A = this chain, B = another copy of it.
Amino acid sequence: MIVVKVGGAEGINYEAVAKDAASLWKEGVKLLLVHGGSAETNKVAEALGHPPRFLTHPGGQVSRLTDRKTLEIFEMVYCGLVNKRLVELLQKEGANAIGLSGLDGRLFVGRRKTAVKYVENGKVKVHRGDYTGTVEEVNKALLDLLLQAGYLPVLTPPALSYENEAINTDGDQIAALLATLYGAEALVYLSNVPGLLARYPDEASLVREIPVERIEDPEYLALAQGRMKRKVMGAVEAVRGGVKRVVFADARVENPIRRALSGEGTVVR
């Protein structure tokens, strides 16, 4: 099992990712693809006159306000535009992809944050209509069933809350969760940069290797505390959880997945 998380930032080469995934699948490789689409969602939300709004936490720590209308646009883009673009591209390449959201078959379920603190005009308030949460359970039976039948699952949020509400959630954590549940050989994170890097945006700052043995060393403190903490420690937890390696790699280049599997990027192990 390989799990490939495709990021949703600008300049993701979907046709390049599709071409690679499809040829891996055709070679007999087990794949699970997870994707996003936050950039395209914003663009669509701008155009529909419902611009993105962000909650600044008492930290903080900013997170998208996923009100119902924002969630709906999230659904249009993640579940509609991107999911089906990716499925179509895969079918053109000879891979029988099947696109699913966390709502479908109760694939992804978790807890909704029903009261989130934020700071507006220097006063702290409580937002009760934010549809965001975690993923704590996966319908692995369904994924297993589709995998056994030979389909290539292409998965996306939103997830389903325990009260059956669609909720936004962290796509990187879904991918990490899937990778640990399946004991994945590799978990690949693709994005519009070459990998984890010390001086962003300089692409020669690329860190090649992060041994989980040495995660609490000062060398690797810089990243584990800096901008990309959530991803880095998610990877560390995944490897500890049984995933043999986690690779951060480039989604722009040709053969993004193959290069990543050959170690080109940041390898957490």
Q: Which residues of A contact B (CB under 8 A)?
A: 44, 47-49, 72, 75-81, 83-85, 87-88, 91-92, 96-101, 103-106, 141-142, 145, 149, 151, 158, 160, 164-166
Contacts and interface: CB of A to CB of B under 8 A. Distances in A.
A81 B79 CA distance: 8
Given A47-B48, A79-B79, A106 B91 contact: yes
B164 A92 contact: yes
Contacts of A49: 47
Contact of A80 (B81, B104, B149): B81
A146 to B, nearest CB: 8
A103 B87 contact: yes
Nearest to A81: B76
A164 B84 CA distance: 12
A145 B145 CA distance: 9
A96 B160 CA distance: 12
Contacts of A104: 87, 97-100
Given A145-B145, A145-B149, A149-B142, A80 B76 contact: yes
